[PDB]
Each structure stands twice: as C-alpha cells, then as structure tokens.
Design a protein around this ligand. Structure first.
Ligand SMILES: *P(=O)(O)OCC(C)(C)[C@@H](O)C(=O)NCCC(=O)NCCS
Lengths: 207, 214, 895, 82, 97
C-alpha cells in the first residue's frame, strides 16, 4: 500500500538553508518522477519543482520563482525525496506537499507546514471590544509570533456563538486573531492561552 | 499560453446532484485523441487527491459518483450524490502545456442553505490600546451566506484593512467575517468618524455602520 | 517535459487502476472464505468438534437404542409391516431435550413450546462464536448473517390440533424460518436470517449462500449451519415401508454389505467470514472454503432418485469456482448414505469427476461421517466439513466404518475408500458432498488454512464469569480440565483470551498471582467453591457511577511506590511530572523521598509526607484512568481534596503542588502543640463528650456513623484519652504531631492565605464533592478562603458520602497507598443499606504490579469496566478456551 | 410492608406465567432483572396484565411489562395508582 | 388470535386510523426473471426490471415478532444503493402494510 511521509519542517528565520525529507514506501520509487508542490496559507496550489526518474536521467526542473535557491535530490537506495531550500525568503511560508508523478499527482503526502519569518517568540497582548449599545462582544489577541494560540470564553464554559477567526499575519510579521461571541442581548471572561510563551492571560469585556 | 477557468463557487446540498464545469482557452484534445486534463479534490484539512485524469478516466479508490466528461475546450465533473465529505476545492488542471505554473483559483464547493443577511457590529477601540500606542477597529459579520460579501472602510482607506473568514459551520453552515483596520496614534486622531460599508448578495441595501469618536 | 514521459505516467495510472479493478473482480467472485469457528453436537456423546474428532478417529460406532424418555412406545413400535419399523437403534441426541432456557433469556414455557431444533441451534451458534475467539455479546449490531439448513420435522404437530401447553408459541416456536431468526434476535445480529429447506442438502446450501452473501459485502461474518432432531419416530416408520433403512441400523457406506441407511440427529454450525477480513482482524483460520456449487438433476429416474451426471456437474462446478484442478484435492467426504441405490451412483460420480488423471500413487481417499453417526439429515454436510477440517488440522484421515469390502457395483479399477486411517509439498485440500433427496446436489472444497510476540505481563489476572454461581463453578472446572491437558501454556495468553474473548457475565471471579504453582489449586477451590488466598469472587452490579476517594494522612508507609516506579512506566511518568511540578516549591525531589535515597527526609516530617501523599495519590488515580476506569465523581479528605481538585481539572498540577507544599510548610510550626485521636462513636456522642474541654478540642473529622477523629492540644488529648479508657471507648491516637482542623490553625491563618495566592481555579470537568460544604462545589470557587476553611473547619466525610450515595454512585475506589477510609465507607454503606462496594489500590507492604492487578481484578469483579487491553496487551497469541458451561434442563412436550 | 407483598405477588404471577406447569424459576425473577431479559412477549405481557389487574382489581395498560421492565418498577407503578 | 394479532372484522386495513390487525390469505405468485442483457439478446418482452434489492434482519428488537424501524430504513437504503438510485427517484411504494 503506497505511503508518503514528509518531515523536516519547523520554524526558520529567513535566509538560511533547510531540508525537507519525504520517505516513500509501497511502490517502486525508482521508476516514478517525483514532485514537490507548495501551497501558501489561503492561496491556491503552486507547483515548486520535480525530478525525473534515474532511468530518464534524474535531471531536475523548478518553478520560475525558485531558480537556483531550491534543489531536489533523491536517495533511491532508501527511497527518500529531499527538497533543499537555500536562502529562504519571508514569502516562502507554505504547506509543502510531497507528490508522486511529474505531470500527474496521483498521490500526495500529508504536507509539511514550513513557516518562515524574522519574528522571534512573543507572548499575546489581549485587547477588549466593548459591546455595542442582539449583542456581540469579543477580545482580540495581538502580537504573538508562534502558533497555535487558543482562546476559551469563561474557561471553555461558553461554546455557543463563539467564532474564533483564523490568525492573520500583519506586515510587522506578528499574528493577531480575534475571538467574538454573540450573547443573547452575567460576567463574560475570555482566556487566551499561549503555550510557546506559557501565557494564560484573562480579561473581562464590559461596556 | 493555455488558460482554464471554472465557476468561482458552486453551493451544493446532499440530496441533488451537481456539475462543476470549466473551459480552457485552447483545444486540449491532443493529437492522440486524449484531452490532457485532470481533476483534483482538496478537502479542508487534508492534502489534495486525484479524482479524474485524461478527461473521463476515473482513478481507483475514488467514489463512482464522480464522473468526468467533455472534450475540446469544455469539460465537466458530474457528481451524482453530494455528501458532506466531498466539500472542498475542485481544481480542473490541464497538462497539454508544460511546465504548469499553478493549479488556478479552483472552485470552492460548500453546503448550500437559505440566504441570510449579515449582522453588522462595529466595535470601539478600547482606551487601553489607545494608551498602548496603536489604534485598531474591527467590523463583524455573523450568520450570513454565501461568502464573498465585501467590506470597506470610509474614513476611503484601502491599504490598512485585513480580513478573516471563518470556515463553514458544521451545524447551520453559516459564515462570518472579521475585518480589522489598524492606524497609528497620530493617524487615528485626524478624522472624527469611521464607517464600515458592507455589501452582500443577501443584503437589500449596503447597510453601513458608523462610529464617531476620533 | 517530453510527450513520452508525460503519457508514461498516465499509462502507469491506467494500468494500476486496471490491476485494482481486476483484483476487485477476483475478490468479488472467487473469494476464499475462512472458517473461523465451529460447533457441533452429534450422537455418541459428542459436544465439541474435538469430541467429533476423537469419536471418528477412534472408530467409535455411535449408534444405540431408541430413546425412552420421548414418549415413544418403543417396545410396541418394533416389528421385523403395516405401520411399524424393523430398526431398534440409530444415532440419537438423548440430551436433545436439554436446554439452558435462562441463559438465552428464553422462558421454560417458550422453551418447551419451542422446537428442539431451535434449542440446539442457539447453543451451537453461541459455542461456534465462542470458539472463534469472538465474544457473542460484542457481535450485537454487526452485519452478521445467519444461514441455517433446517426442516419442519414436527414437534408440535400443526396438523393435529396443537397441544394446550404450547398454545401461542407453536408458530414462533416451530416455523423453520424462526430457527435462523432466533439466533439473530438473541445475539442481536443484523445480517439476513434465512433458513433453507432442502431435505438432506440444506446445510451445505446454507454454507453456499453464506459464501455468496459474504462475497457481495452483504455480511461481515456469517453463521452456516444445520440441525436435525426427531420428536417422533415417523422418519423410521415411513422409510421402513420401502427397504431403505438398514436392517441393523449401520450405514455401510460404499461397502459390499450396503443394505440401507439409518437416520440420525445432530446440530452443526460454522462461523465464517472473508479470508482477508480474518487476516485483518487477526482471527485464527481453521480452514478455507475455496469454492462451492449447487445444481439439480431434474431428469432423474423418479423424484427421489440420484443422478451421476448432476453430481459430476456440481463437483466440476465447485472445482472451477475455486479455480482448482481435480487432482488438487486428496480427500472427499462423500455423502455415503449407505443405500444400495445411492452408493454406486455416488461412487461412479466421484470416480468420473475427481479420479481421471491423478498420479498413480495418490488415489482420492473417500470416507463418510455417516458410517460413524448415521445419516444426520439436514446437518450432514456441515458436519462433514467439520470432519474434514479436523482431518486437515490433525493431518490424518480417519477410517470409515463397516467397510468389509468395497462394493462391487462400481469398477474401482484412482479412488480408494478409507478402510483404515491414513496419514498425510502443497496445501491439503478436501471436498465435501451433501447430495439431497429432492435432487439439490451440493459440493464444497476446503483447503488447509495458511500459516500465520510480546513480553509476559506479571501477575496477569485470570478472569471467569457466568450467569449463575453453579455455572461459574462449572466454568472453573472446565478450564481446570482444559489446562491440565496442555503442555505448559502461557499464562498471559490465557489471561488475554479470558478477558477479551469471553462475555463478562454477572457472577464473576478472578485469580491474581505471579507464580505458576497456585493457579491450579485456586481453580480447584473455585470449582468446589472453597476460598483461596489468590482468589476473588463477587456479583457485578448492573449499573452504578464510579467514585475516586482521596483520604488525608495515614495512608503512608516506607517504600510505597518504589516497586511501581520500576515496574510501571506510566506511574513513573506521572511521578516524574509531579516531581517537576513540586521542584520549584520545595528543596528536594519526590523520587529520592519515595525511593529512600540516602539523606532524603523521612515521612516523619509533616511538610514532606503530605506532598508525597499528594503525588502518590495523583499518580495512582491517573494510572487508574489510564487503565480505563474514568471516575464519575471525586471526593477528598483534608489535604487529599487538593489531589481531588487536581483530578477534577479545577486545579492545574502546578497550582495543586503549590497549595499542598505551602500549606504543609505553613503547618510546620504547629508541630508538637497538639494532635488527633480517632474514637469510634456517633458525632453527637463525641460532641457532647468534648463539652468539658470546650475550645481546647474539636471534631476534626466525621469519617462515619461510628468513627470520628477529634483534634486538639496534647494535654487535653491525653485527658480525653484517659476519660475514654475509663469509659471503655476504643480511642486511638493517630501518629501526628500537629492538630489540624482545630482552632490552633488560626495562629497561622494569614500564612495559609499566602499558600493559595496566585492560583487559577477552573470549573470542574468531573463533579467534585467538597467535604467542607457537603455537596458538589463549583470548580471556580476553590479559592484561598476555601483552602483555609478546609484546613480549619471540621471534615464532614460521612455527610458527603451519604449524599454521593444518594446520587446513584455505587463504586468507591481508594487511590491510596493503603486503605484508610474503607472501614468508614463500608460502615456508611451498611448504615444506609446500599449495595456499594469499596476497593483500594495498594496495601501496606504491598505496592508491586501484583497488588495493582489484584485491585483491578477486584474492581472488575465488582462490575467496574476495565480496559484489559492496556493491562494485558493489544493482541496476544490466540488461545482455545472451553466454551460456556451451560446449565441445561429437560424441556419436552408430553401428550 | 406493602411494597414487599406487591413484589411477592408480581414475582409469583411472573413465575407462573413463565412456567408451562407446576420452584427454580420462582427465584429466577429478581427485582433487577428486566422482564424482556426474561424473554417476555406480547402474549405473556397481556397475561401478566390480566393476572395483576385481577389481583389488584385495577385496569392497566396492555404493555405493563416493557414500559416498566424491572419487577421493582412494576411494583412502583402499582403502588403509584393504588 | 391468542396473540390478538388479527382484525376482528377480517379486513386488512393498511395504514388506516381504524386498523386493528391483519388477516391471513392463501395464494401462489411466481416470477420468471432473467438478466436484462440476456432478455434483450433473446428478445423476450421485458415486463419490468428489478434494479436493486437488499435484505437484512431486525436484530435485538422489542420482540422476535415485532419489527425494527432502523433495520427497515437500512434495508430500504441498501436497496437504493444497490440500485444506484436515490430516494427521489422512486414514485410509489408497495408497502408491506
Ligand atoms: P407483541 O408486540 O410482541 O405481539 C403483538 C403482535 C402479534 C401484533 C406483534 O407480534 C406483531 O404482529 N408485530 C408486527 C409484525 C409485522 O408487522 N409483520 C410480520 C409479518 S406479519
């Protein structure tokens, strides 16, 4: 049964090298031409590159945006595909997918989330949002670099109406999501738990 | 250069079939009598997977309900039975011309439901962040469908807004939008009124919400 | 990319999909089915398939006189013409009227009104499921088929004004469809329940239909079986008018002395499923039904006559369905009725079909089970396949009886009979035939099952259970006898098989010991019901919510948790987490204190014992949860409540560690000022007894209706001890130098408020019961004032235990190193007249894996569900345990 | 004392209906075991209904064997409307 | 009649508010069926075509005689899936009734 397992992700500051390994198990790895295809957060699929089979010659081709910087190789003896990402740029954050077949991507790997930015680890800065004066109230998490960060209303007691939006990267390189609840027209606390900083911030929202 | 285009979105329901169509800018039928086209599915949270190749040949392990059809420039992927597991993004992607720069915008597929207008809620900037040295104002939309409602900030700033869209709900298949506009302290204290104008196909009029503190 | 390499990948995808579709076709038509279990009851004392094998291998002739308890006029109905018979012996199930009505829920009224075919078939199906390594109770809701070959032999006689006793149940109790339906109704199966009426071929046709149903995905597993019982002797009388029955009653199969065919009773069932499914699920494969075929003859010389052409055609069809050449099989379980008309035709059909191109040194060996037990009838083919299955398993073909000479009606000069046993490069294969009297010929081909560790957990419990205590004793005796005849079985495998592949019934017992010298005597003492040291017994409760109990001090002893640290890795991990949490708020490590490392403080100091108790209790409770016992409630006692507050989720590990450590450190100055004394009296009596001393003493804790601890100054404590000695009250001084739950703690009150500062309480995930308030408490309310009140105000353990019992809680698991509150809990339980059962985890000088498994087995015996997979393993080697020991009673209809 | 007597009457009637004729099954009806687990059908259900109604002189619903599956539940139901 | 599972008036009032039982009846009914491709090749006048079929079992229902709703809808769905049709593609139903 065909299996592709990726590895070698992790946070990396811009402008250094990185290696993405992808091991194949369940087919003749040598005959297949092997491809890497990235997908930025929120954007569509974007092919990165591929390598022909050793029988064809083993040559490599890459997408227009990755001339020279990126490299593809393959250990046929142990059947792993290696993507060497040299001099990462800030816009290379994506979920790199490992796929079989140069032109037809019949099977895909689980995908490795490679995130690149110059920001270092920070803790969240939670701000309130007063209710309007049928009632909505929220707290906005700001200035946290790493992910994930969880938000629980009344320590998880409140579940109905909670809409924790996806995190968005600001131009400064810091993420800032926001949690909001539509209350039906008692105290409303929200707790932001940030494991990379071990932060457990709490806050009330009141007019 | 060959260009392929499909509908941007196509709401569907479990209970009635569907057909995701798409057209190329060139006759994809190769000289060997094969339309060098493929159809892939990407589910939310899972990697992309192949559905169809060479126009109509279905891949093994795919449900039989899927069926590719068409020729020349015009192609379609017909699904007899729609299921919640099949919601995702469907990419019809050519292979006649290589190398392929990108898959394309795809075609989002989502659970269809009755139209509902959004609940607009402009929120104030808390004084604590004002003394922190930054201004941020957030506009909220909840319980609306379909997605794609456009929100703009009249202060008509169009270079400081960032939007976040919640995924389709599991219970009622609703959508929500949160648009945050950020400004500096000196920039914040220049205009004494900020309005969020939202447009949605389910809205009779562009229901605006204003906020006047400066 | 070039066009060639581009189209190459499309070609690869296309040919891979082609191979997948072709393999789908192959597994959708010619799929080998796996016989994962079987169960038969055939005449001659046979009760299990092993009984059948030892019967047939020994050459025993299982034909005896007619039954006398069935109401037959046996002395009168024998005449060697008008309406009599000339045979006085045949294969009979003399226990056919015996059935365990209570086990299956059936009533004696329905049971006696019910056909014995159904009664035998239910037990046979249950045993067949049990012998497959499957728990029948876990088969409820599965898409399991039921295909029974039965017939309306006539037990209630619908044509004769059905009796008054069996009135109302003579449809449900006697329709042949209900024979298959009742199996699925009782076992809760969901696959189709179809009964087949085909006379002497119904069971093999049922196997065919089950195979087709499984191949089409309509079923996950299937029951292919047959049954035959003789409520009345009419089958002998009607077939005696024509000379069809043998004069002596012996089915001389294929012999020159063939002169008739004696009928017989018997039930025989197989539990089968797809071979790929069996391999995936890790079921033991006994044999592999490769192919099957069924057809008719039609143009036979008379309706009830055979046809060599039809038999050859079905044999060839079965061979082609399996994709096997005729020479592949080296044995056939021929029908072998014994009739003069039938035997030559069957032999000619077998010779024409099978033996035509075989090697000149491997003749086809033909035999018949009918020579041993007579003609079983509907259950003939499904018994013959069992015979061939065990022949392949033991690698020897048993002899067919009463063959003085091969019959001269057929030219043997390819195929030879099994006059004597014969022993056995390629897999063993054998055919079975079930040719019927209605012309429906059937044939199956079976093949030898294809060829298929973990460290042994110490002190693996051996679990036994039954509906009634007598059935439990029978189960113990049967298991003891089975283990006696086995060369050194692996005890952990037996434990796994008993825990997983057998239903947990009401009356339960367990054997927990780490040496293979006491299990035998323990099984014996269970058999005659005598007690034993390593034996536990009990009656599991049908319903009840679980409680974790966290006493305070007292449950300490040096070396506790030391053995568990090495043996149990989960306990080691939990202790490590507790140590990491505690390190910042104390000047030593938990592991050193528990292991007794040199220089580490002893348990005499108050500030070190309480954190150690907290860590041990939390780790033990988490170990219980890891073993699958998730509490429905938690209760504490003084500092133990902090541990409870951690397990309830209200307090994080860091917060609980901070509270316990700082509280004990702030309690250090109280040492030497006073102490506690436990006296056994009611709360009111102790309260009015402490009246002369006033504020000096106070009620520290109301543990139970006759167990109260009073705390106070040492001088007043000694005065009260002397007063109790004068009054003859059993007052015991606890080994503590500090008077908790007394006024003295006010002197340190502010420091206690510093202990709980900075914590972050959260709502309880598991309902926590506060012993201070006496009812459930919200998790967010656990503030510093609450902890000060806990240290100061009297514990009301009795009241909260009564309230918790009022809320339907019935199991009390003490997660201590030694039970300290079990006495008070049991006192409260018997005072309120409830059926709750108390248990503990470890005991003094007993903290190894053996005691842990003893506690787990005790909890399971009390009825608490336990994830035995974690305790024992995910999958061990299969072990063939004895089936259920049914306690049968006679059920028969009188005229 | 009334509850014990009613439980005894229910147990006796259930045992009599459960037996074709003529003690072993009299104790087999414990207060906790469900009647459906004892293998009761519509016919025996209506027979228990008639017997209990005749004993207590009260008209009961024709499914007073599965609405209250335990005998103790039946005793509680009888004690309610009596 | 002991089970009280028959109509006192004798009529088999199906799905009626006044329905109070069933009633038995004799009868023989047989179909000569064939594969549709074989029928078209041989030219036999096809009267109708069974497209899909399914059988299951009630299981642990309220009684051996009593039915099971979940099993009934499950076999209906299985028959539809075997037929390759959906619930909206069936116009009427010959209910057991
Ligand atoms: P009780 O519910 O156990 O028995 C009463 C009954 C005889 C009416 C019942 O068994 C019944 O007939 N249920 C419906 C069964 C049915 O609709 N079809 C089965 C073939 S008639």
């Amino acid at each position: 049964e065909v299996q592709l397992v990726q590895s070698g992700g992790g946070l990396v500051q811009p402008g250094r090298s990185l290696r993405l390994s992808c091991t194949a198990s369940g087919f003749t790895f040598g005959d297949y031409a092997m491809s890497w295809v990235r997908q930025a957060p929120g954007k569509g699929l974007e092919w990165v590159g591929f390598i022909r089979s050793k029988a064809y010659g083993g040559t490599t081709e890459y997408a227009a945006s990755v001339k020279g910087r990126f490299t593809i190789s393959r250990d046929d003896s142990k059947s792993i595909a290696y993507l060497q990402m040299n001099s990462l740029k800030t816009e290379d954050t994506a979920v790199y997918y490992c796929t079989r077949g140069g032109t037809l991507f019949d099977y895909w790997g689980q995908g490795t989330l490679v995130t690149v930015s110059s920001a270092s680890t920070k803790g969240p800065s939670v701000f309130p949002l007063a209710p309007s004066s049928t009632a909505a109230l929220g707290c906005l998490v700001k200035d946290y670099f790493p992910e994930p960060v969880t938000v629980s209303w009344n320590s998880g007691a409140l579940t109905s109406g909670v809409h924790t939006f996806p995190a968005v990267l600001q131009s400064s390189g810091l993420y800032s999501l926001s949690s909001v609840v539509t209350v039906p027209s008692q105290t409303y606390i929200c707790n932001v738990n940030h494991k990379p900083s071990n932060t457990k911030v709490d806050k009330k929202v009141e007019p | 250069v060959v260009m392929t285009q499909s509908p941007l979105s196509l709401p569907v329901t479990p209970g009635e079939p569907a057909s995701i169509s798409c057209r190329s800018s060139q006759s994809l039928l190769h000289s060997n009598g094969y339309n060098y086209l493929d159809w892939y599915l990407q589910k939310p949270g899972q990697s992309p997977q192949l559905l169809i190749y060479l126009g109509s040949n279905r891949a093994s392990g795919v449900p039989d309900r899927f069926s590719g059809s068409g020729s020349g420039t015009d192609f379609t992927l017909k699904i007899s039975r729609v299921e919640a597991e099949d919601v995702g993004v469907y990419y019809c992607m050519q292979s006649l011309q290589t190398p392929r720069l990108t898959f394309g915008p795809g075609t989002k597929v989502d659970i269809k439901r009755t139209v509902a207008a959004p609940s607009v809620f402009i929120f104030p900037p808390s004084d604590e962040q004002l003394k922190s040295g930054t201004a941020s104002v957030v506009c909220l939309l909840n319980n609306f469908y379909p997605r794609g409602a456009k929100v703009q900030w009249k202060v008509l700033q169009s270079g400081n807004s960032q939007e976040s869209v919640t995924e389709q709900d599991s219970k009622d298949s609703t959508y929500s939008l949160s648009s945050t506009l950020t400004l500096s302290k000196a920039d914040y204290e220049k205009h004494k009124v900020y309005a969020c104008e939202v447009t949605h196909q389910g809205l009779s009029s562009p229901v605006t919400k204003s906020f006047n503190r400066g | 990319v070039t066009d060639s390499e581009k189209v190459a990948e499309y070609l690869r995808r296309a040919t891979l999909d082609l191979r997948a579709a072709r393999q789908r076709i192959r597994e959708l038509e010619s799929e080998p089915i796996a016989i994962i279990g079987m169960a038969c009851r055939l005449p001659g004392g046979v009760d299990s398939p092993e009984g059948l094998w030892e019967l047939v291998d020994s050459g025993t002739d299982a034909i005896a006189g007619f039954p006398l308890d069935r109401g037959w006029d046996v002395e009168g109905m024998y005449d060697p013409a008008p309406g009599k018979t000339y045979v006085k012996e045949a294969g009979f199930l003399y226990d056919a009227g015996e059935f365990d009505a209570g086990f299956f829920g059936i009533s004696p009224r329905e049971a006696v009104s019910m056909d014995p075919q159904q009664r035998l078939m239910l037990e046979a199906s249950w045993e067949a499921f049990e012998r497959a390594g499957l728990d029948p109770a876990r088969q409820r809701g599965t898409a399991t088929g039921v295909f029974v070959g039965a017939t309306a032999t006539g037990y209630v006689s619908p044509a004769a004004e059905v009796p008054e006793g069996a009135e109302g149940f003579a449809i449900t109790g006697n329709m042949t469809a209900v024979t298959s339906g009742r199996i699925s109704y009782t076992l809760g199966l969901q696959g189709p329940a179809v009964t087949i009426d085909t006379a002497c071929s119904s069971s093999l046709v049922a196997l065919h239909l089950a195979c087709q149903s499984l191949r089409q995905g309509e079923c996950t597993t299937a029951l292919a079986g047959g049954v035959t019982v003789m409520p009345t002797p009419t089958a002998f009388t009607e077939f005696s008018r024509q000379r069809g029955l043998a004069p002596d009653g012996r089915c001389k199969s294929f012999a020159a002395a063939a002169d008739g065919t004696n009928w017989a009773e018997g039930v025989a069932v197989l539990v089968v499923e797809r071979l790929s499914d069996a391999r995936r699920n890790g079921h033991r494969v006994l044999a592999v039904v490769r192919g099957t075929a069924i057809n008719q003859d039609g143009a036979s010389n008379g309706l009830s006559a055979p046809n060599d052409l039809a038999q050859e055609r079905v044999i060839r069809s079965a061979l082609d369905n399996a994709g096997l050449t005729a020479s592949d099989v080296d044995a056939v379980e021929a029908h072998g009725t014994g009739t003069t008309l039938g035997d030559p035709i069957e032999a000619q059909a077998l010779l024409a079909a099978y033996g035509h191109e075989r090697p000149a040194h491997r003749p086809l060996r033909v035999g018949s089970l009918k020579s041993n037990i007579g003609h079983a009838g509907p259950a003939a083919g499904v018994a013959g396949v069992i015979k061939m299955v065990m022949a392949m398993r033991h690698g020897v073909l048993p002899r067919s009886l009463h063959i003085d000479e091969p019959t001269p009606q057929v030219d043997w000069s390819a195929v030879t009979l099994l006059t004597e046993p014969v022993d056995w490069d390629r897999p063993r294969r054998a055919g079975v035939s079930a040719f019927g009297i209605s012309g429906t010929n059937a044939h199956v081909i079976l093949e030898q099952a294809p060829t298929q560790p973990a460290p042994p957990v110490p002190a693996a419990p051996w679990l036994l259970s039954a509906k009634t205590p007598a059935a439990l004793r029978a189960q113990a005796r049967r298991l003891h006898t089975h283990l006696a005849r086995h060369p050194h079985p692996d005890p952990t495998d037996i434990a796994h098989a008993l825990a997983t592949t057998r239903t947990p019934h009401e009356h339960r017992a367990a054997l927990v010991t780490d040496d293979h010298g006491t299990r035998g005597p323990a099984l014996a003492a269970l058999a005659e019901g005598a007690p034993d040291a390593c034996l536990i017994s009990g009656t599991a409760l049908s319903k009840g919510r679980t409680v974790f109990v966290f006493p305070g001090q007292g449950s300490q002893w040096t070396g506790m948790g030391r053995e568990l640290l090495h043996t149990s890795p989960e306990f080691a991990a939990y202790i490590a987490e507790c140590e990491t949490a505690l390190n910042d708020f104390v000047d030593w490590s938990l592991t050193d204190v528990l292991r007794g490392t040199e220089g580490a403080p002893g348990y005499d100091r108050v500030d070190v014992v309480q954190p150690a108790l907290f860590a041990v209790m939390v780790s033990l409770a988490r170990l219980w949860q890891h073993h699958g016992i998730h509490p429905d409630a938690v209760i504490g006692h003084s500092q133990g409540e902090i541990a409870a507050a951690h397990i309830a989720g209200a307090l994080s590990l860091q917060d609980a560690a901070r509270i316990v450590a700082l509280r004990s450190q702030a309690l250090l100055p109280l040492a030497g000022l006073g102490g506690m004394t436990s006296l056994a009296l009611p709360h009111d009596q102790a309260l009015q007894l402490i009246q002369p001393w006033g504020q000096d003493l106070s009620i520290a804790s109301v543990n139970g209706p006759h167990s109260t601890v009073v705390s106070g100054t040492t001088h007043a404590l000694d005065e009260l001890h002397t007063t109790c000695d004068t009054q003859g009250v059993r007052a015991r001084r606890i080994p503590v130098d500090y008077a908790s739950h007394s006024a003295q703690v006010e002197s340190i009150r502010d420091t206690v408020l510093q202990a709980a500062t900075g914590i972050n309480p959260q709502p309880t995930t598991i309902p926590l019961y506060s012993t201070v308030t006496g009812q459930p408490i919200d998790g967010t309310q656990l503030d510093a004032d609450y902890w000060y009140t806990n240290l100061r105000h009297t514990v009301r353990f009795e009241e909260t235990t009564r309230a918790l019992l009022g809320s339907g809680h019935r199991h009390f698991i003490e997660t201590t190193a030694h039970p300290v509150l079990a006495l008070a809990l049991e006192e409260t339980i018997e005072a309120t007249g409830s059926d709750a059962r108390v248990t503990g985890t470890l005991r003094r000088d007993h903290g190894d894996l053996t005691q842990l498994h003893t506690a787990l087995a005790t909890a399971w015996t009390h009825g608490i569900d336990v994830d035995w997979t974690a305790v024992l393993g995910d999958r061990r080697t299969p072990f063939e345990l004895p089936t259920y020991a049914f306690q049968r009673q006679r059920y028969w209809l009188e005229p | 004392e009334r509850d014990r007597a009613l439980l005894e009457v229910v147990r006796g009637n259930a045992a009599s209906v459960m037996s074709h004729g003529a003690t072993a099954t009299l104790e087999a009806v414990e207060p906790t075991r469900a009647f459906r687990d004892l293998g009761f059908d519509s016919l025996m259900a209506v027979e228990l209904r008639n017997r209990i109604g005749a004993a207590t002189g009260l008209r009961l619903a024709p499914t007073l064997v599965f609405d209250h599956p335990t005998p103790e539940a039946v005793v509680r139901h009888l004690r309610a409307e009596l």
